[PDB]
Ligand binder design. Structure first.
Ligand SMILES: [Mg+2]
Lengths: 7, 165, 300
């Protein structure tokens, strides 16, 4: 899994 | 262009909207300021809806941290359960579930801040404005699960919170 | 109009040990000890395990009895675990017959032919005991373990202390909640294989999974307890005493996957029952809880 954050 | 009363996409919409509603309630019940969450509602919505639809969303993560130390005070995970069928099953958004857990989570530090991230399956479609992120350390912490928080016909978000020890 | 809270209070009460059951357990121990002392050098025995911690659910089955062997039987201690267990099995089969005696990983089960009726009542009688050969090394014991073939260290005192301390920090509701989940674990709807093996793992996980003190609502405590069990049953759960194998070592991968699935379904059934009550369907809620747990959960 790969965790994502907003930009 | 038939629109079905019961469908996977309606269940996805329900769960998307009420996961975000539930996180807003967690922020409010925690004594925090929802403005930062408000400012990103539409971008959070677009990404959550997209990756639910393809089965790529694993968890919604809300880190709550102390700004003075930058350490987690707690972290709320909404794990997705991909158990949908038919679309005409029972549904609910169990706010009372969160109020019972939040009592047990314990008081938060003054002026605690929060950050939302999305855990996704590697093959996920790119969503504009979202990049690989980093977790705040959960060393010394374990996760408490609460059960099905947001439910629609088997597609569900199951809330849990991290605590010390 | 039976409320959910009242129903759970009744359910809690109906899982509690009573004095006739207590005396019947002591009578079976005497019966089993006195017979085994005619076939082995046994210095003493004592009721132990969940039964002595008051964390055993009802009907009372698999009550652990440590049979402490004399030094003159210490040759068993240097032999493989199966040797003393097979000897206990043969000896007990002589008295109770082959059908009533079942060889287990660390004990021999003796079933006393007690009938369990449709309400899970036994006329205040225990159903079976687990005879455990044991050597007293001083402050702790060693018992046979067929999984390794070796003798493993164990300390019942520590398990009792940890249960007591968890119970005090949960407004004395901790042991009741544990008994409720062990009761679900024994529900016949699961078939011949319990969802969680051993049932002690439910208690060990509870030491950590029941967190933050008692919050006052059984439906929520149960919903979260099941949800946390399912999410964490794949963690390593060591012996709380730090002496023997991990308590989570007895299920293989397929059985652990089944354990999480059935634990998750229990969590989902609890959510459905909570939803019923939220929608004012009080009878459906009670019937949902009874279908989850079993006959001892009341409807009125
Ligand atoms: Mg036991």
């Amino acid at each position: 899994a790969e965790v994502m954050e907003f930009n | 262009s038939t629109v079905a009363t019961y469908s996977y996409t309606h269940s996805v919409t329900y769960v998307t909207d009420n996961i975000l509603k539930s996180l807003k309630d967690i922020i409010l019940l925690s004594g925090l300021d929802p403005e930062h969450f408000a400012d990103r509602w539409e971008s959070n919505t677009r990404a959550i809806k997209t990756w639910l639809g393809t089965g790529d969303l694993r968890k919604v993560i809300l880190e709550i941290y102390n700004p003075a130390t930058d350490k987690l005070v707690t972290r709320w995970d909404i794990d997705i359960v991909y158990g949908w069928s038919d679309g005409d099953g029972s549904f609910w958004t169990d706010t009372e579930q969160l109020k019972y857990a939040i009592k047990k989570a314990g008081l938060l530090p003054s002026q605690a801040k929060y950050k939302l991230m999305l855990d996704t399956k590697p093959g996920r479609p790119d969503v504009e404005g979202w990049s690989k992120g980093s977790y705040r350390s959960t060393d010394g912490m374990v996760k408490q699960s609460l059960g099905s928080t947001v439910e629609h016909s088997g597609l569900a978000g199951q809330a849990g919170y991290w605590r010390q020890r | 109009m039976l409320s959910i809270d009242e129903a759970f209070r009744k359910f809690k009460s109906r899982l509690e040990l009573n004095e006739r059951e207590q005396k019947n357990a002591s009578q079976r121990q005497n019966e089993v000890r006195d017979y085994l002392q005619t076939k082995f050098g046994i210095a003493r025995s004592f009721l132990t395990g969940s039964y002595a911690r008051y964390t055993k659910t009802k009907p009372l089955k698999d009550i652990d009895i440590f049979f402490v062997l004399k030094d003159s039987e210490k040759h068993y201690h240097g032999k493989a675990a199966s040797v003393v267990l097979d000897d206990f099995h043969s000896a007990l089969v002589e008295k109770y017959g082959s059908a009533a005696v079942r060889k287990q990983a660390r004990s021999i089960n003796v079933d006393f032919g007690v009938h369990i009726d449709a309400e899970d009542n036994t006329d205040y009688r225990v159903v079976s005991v687990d005879a455990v050969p044991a050597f007293d090394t001083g402050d702790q014991y060693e018992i046979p373990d067929t999984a390794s073939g070796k003798w493993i260290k164990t300390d019942p005192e520590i398990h009792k202390d940890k249960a007591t301390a968890a119970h005090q920090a949960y407004a004395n509701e901790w042991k009741g909640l544990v008994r409720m989940v062990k009761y679900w674990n024994n529900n016949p709807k699961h078939g011949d294989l319990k969802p969680v093996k051993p049932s002690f793992l439910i208690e060990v996980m509870a030491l950590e999974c029941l967190y933050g003190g008692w919050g006052g609502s059984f439906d929520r405590e149960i919903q979260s307890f099941f949800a946390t069990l399912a999410d964490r049953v794949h963690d390593e759960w060591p012996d709380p005493a730090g002496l023997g194998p991990a308590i989570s070592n007895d299920m293989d991968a397929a059985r652990k996957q089944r354990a999480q699935q059935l634990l998750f379904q229990a969590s989902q059934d609890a959510s459905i029952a909570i939803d019923h009550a939220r929608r004012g369907r009080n009878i459906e809620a009670l019937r949902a809880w009874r279908a989850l747990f079993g006959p001892k959960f009341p409807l009125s």
